[PDB]
């Protein structure tokens, strides 16, 4: 049977009409010389990402997209021909079901379109009239054909956004990492599907006799082994078309690596060094050294607080600072490894103060820099710290260094 040309033709044909007519409509100012608003609003009221109806239909297009890939992985794993009759991957019903929705959603996106041509030339739109029509020819023929349906994996680009409205993940770095993973998976699966499709039938030049009988799974593997530069050469593209695409996919992956690592991946690699509470230490007492953490002050405080001559005592020391322990971590750590933690949150922020669980502390100890330029300023900052600690929890012991005597009156 040779009718497989008509499937790809039916996609290209719908694209053709799309690019010609939508542009031809916006020409000649003079229309001739010598209800639309309502339907547009009804279509666009649901399309809003902030609206509940739009966020839940966007979860739907994504879930149905993955379902279309699952069934794609099922049939792409079969031989080139099979007796498709009594059990053709749960029949023409599941074959139509997803694209009956996507065709309605493509129609919805077109009547919802607010800038006609731009709606068609959005990359998110282009993939729809590639994946939808080939299946509409498959159902007319009542015979499955392995088409370009793997391009549907490009809907995975949206996975970061749905994780943001469903409120599962909140950190910006986490959202960027999920975005990057999603785009990497989408391009890997697209390029693997292209190589599979190019190797399913042989090169034209040898009358399709040089065809490599490999699965989509051997194909997606090959591309991982290649883009990681491992290149075992246990499997490689034999076809000249396969090679031509393979040199292009090497160059696209290298370009993406060069254009992504210095910009986003490097930023994601370096994150916070400290966060979360002092928790998972049963029974003990707890204190926070608030205020001015610097190497000398903590070296002389810790050496007396934990000198091992107190006998019946616990460790406690949680620590809190706003400018981080950049040098403290190499110049001294906290004179213990398993015990004595470090919070990167400030003393003034209520959320960071809750992070240390100040309410459960026995005391806050406020250290001051004796080496200040303005003793009055440093004292007033420590009084501000005292005020914040007392405001969060009135019932807590506080001990505090004051650089000047007259400032002690402000604590009263």
């Amino acid at each position: 049977q040779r009718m497989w040309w008509a499937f790809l033709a039916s996609s290209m044909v719908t694209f053709f009409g799309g690019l010609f007519i939508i542009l031809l409509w916006r020409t000649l100012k003079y229309l001739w010389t010598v209800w639309m608003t309502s339907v547009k609003d009804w279509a666009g009221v649901m399309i809003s990402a902030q609206t509940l109806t739009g966020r839940v239909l966007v979860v739907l297009v994504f879930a149905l997209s993955i379902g279309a890939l699952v069934i794609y992985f099922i049939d792409s794993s079969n031989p080139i021909e099979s007796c498709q009759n009594f059990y053709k991957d749960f029949t023409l019903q599941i074959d139509m079901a997803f694209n009956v929705f996507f065709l309605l959603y493509f129609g919805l996106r077109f009547i919802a379109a607010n800038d006609k041509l731009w709606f068609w030339l959005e990359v998110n739109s282009v993939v729809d009239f590639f994946t939808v029509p080939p299946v509409f020819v498959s159902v007319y023929l009542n015979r499955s054909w392995l088409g370009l349906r793997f391009l549907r994996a490009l809907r995975l680009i949206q996975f970061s956004e749905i994780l943001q409205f469903l409120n599962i993940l909140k950190t910006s770095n986490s959202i960027k990492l999920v975005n990057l993973l999603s785009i990497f998976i989408s391009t890997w699966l697209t390029a693997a599907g292209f190589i599979h499709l190019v190797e399913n039938s042989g090169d034209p030049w040898e009358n399709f006799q040089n065809n490599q009988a490999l699965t989509y799974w051997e194909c997606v593997y090959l591309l991982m082994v290649t883009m990681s530069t491992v290149g075992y050469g246990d499997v490689y593209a034999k076809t000249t078309l396969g090679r031509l695409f393979m040199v292009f996919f090497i160059l696209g992956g290298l370009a993406m690596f060069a254009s992504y690592v210095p910009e986003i991946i490097e930023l994601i690699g370096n994150r916070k060094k400290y966060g979360g509470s002092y928790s998972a230490v049963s029974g003990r007492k707890h204190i926070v050294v608030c205020g001015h953490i610097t190497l000398e002050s903590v070296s002389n405080f810790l050496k007396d607080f934990l000198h091992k001559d107190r006998d019946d005592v616990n460790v406690e020391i949680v620590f809190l600072h706003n400018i981080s322990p950049n040098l403290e971590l190499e110049a001294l750590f906290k004179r213990h490894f398993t015990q004595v933690e470090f919070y990167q949150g400030s003393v003034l922020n209520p959320h960071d103060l809750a992070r240390v669980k100040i309410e459960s502390a026995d005391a806050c100890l406020i250290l001051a820099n004796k080496y200040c330029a303005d003793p009055d300023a440093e004292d007033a900052s420590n009084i501000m710290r005292v005020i914040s600690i007392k405001n969060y929890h009135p019932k807590i012991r506080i001990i505090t260094q004051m650089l000047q005597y007259h400032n002690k009156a402000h604590l009263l």
Binding site: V70, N78, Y87, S279, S360
Partner: protein
């Protein structure tokens, strides 16, 4: 002393989420990976195929035998071709023992186990040949026959067993359940 600080959690709901995710992904991988042997098993139906004729073609085929100490010797055995007749299809077809035997050699309807002595292999052929000449024509028995890909092939034994297909599928399903109980039981503990 300590408060609700004593609960902590961290390594429990986290483990429970990793357990449900491992369970669903594992059965999802096995799903794409078992359809083919399951397809092949379902493609063959049950018939009462009957032995139509055994003839001795006289061909000689080489088999590989191993002693366990990486033996690479090869021995020769005579080729036995047996043609059967289907019950509901009344079509002449080629007998085969099993899938392994078919894919290693489809000319001979049986491959006896490879023997280090050719005389012993020939005796096993005459022994198996005698154990196949007695039941000819009559006494139809349970038979497996494919009428989609290999209409001229008939297997005595099944390609695969449901026992290993089920035994690998039950584990990710229970692993998902073990993840769900650890999630909801952690939420039950977190209340009070």
């Amino acid at each position: 002393t300590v408060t609700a600080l004593k609960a902590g959690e961290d390594k429990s709901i986290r483990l429970g989420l990793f357990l449900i995710i491992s369970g669903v992904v594992s059965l999802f991988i096995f799903g794409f990976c078992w359809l083919s042997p399951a397809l092949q098993d379902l493609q063959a139906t049950e018939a009462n195929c009957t032995v139509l004729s055994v003839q001795q073609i006289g061909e000689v085929f080489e088999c590989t035998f191993t002693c366990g100490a990486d033996c690479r010797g090869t021995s020769q055995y005579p080729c036995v071709q047996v043609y059967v007749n289907n019950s509901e299809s009344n079509s002449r077809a080629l007998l085969h023992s099993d899938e392994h035997q078919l894919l290693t050699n489809p000319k001979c309807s049986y491959i006896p186990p490879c023997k280090r002595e050719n005389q012993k292999n020939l005796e096993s052929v005459m022994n198996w040949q005698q154990y196949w000449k007695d039941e000819i024509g009559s006494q139809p028995f349970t038979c497996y026959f494919n009428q989609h890909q290999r209409p001229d092939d008939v297997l005595l034994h099944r390609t695969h067993d449901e026992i290993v297909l089920l035994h690998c599928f039950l584990w990710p399903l229970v692993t998902f359940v073990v993840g769900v109980l650890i999630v909801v039981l952690t939420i039950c503990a977190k209340s009070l």
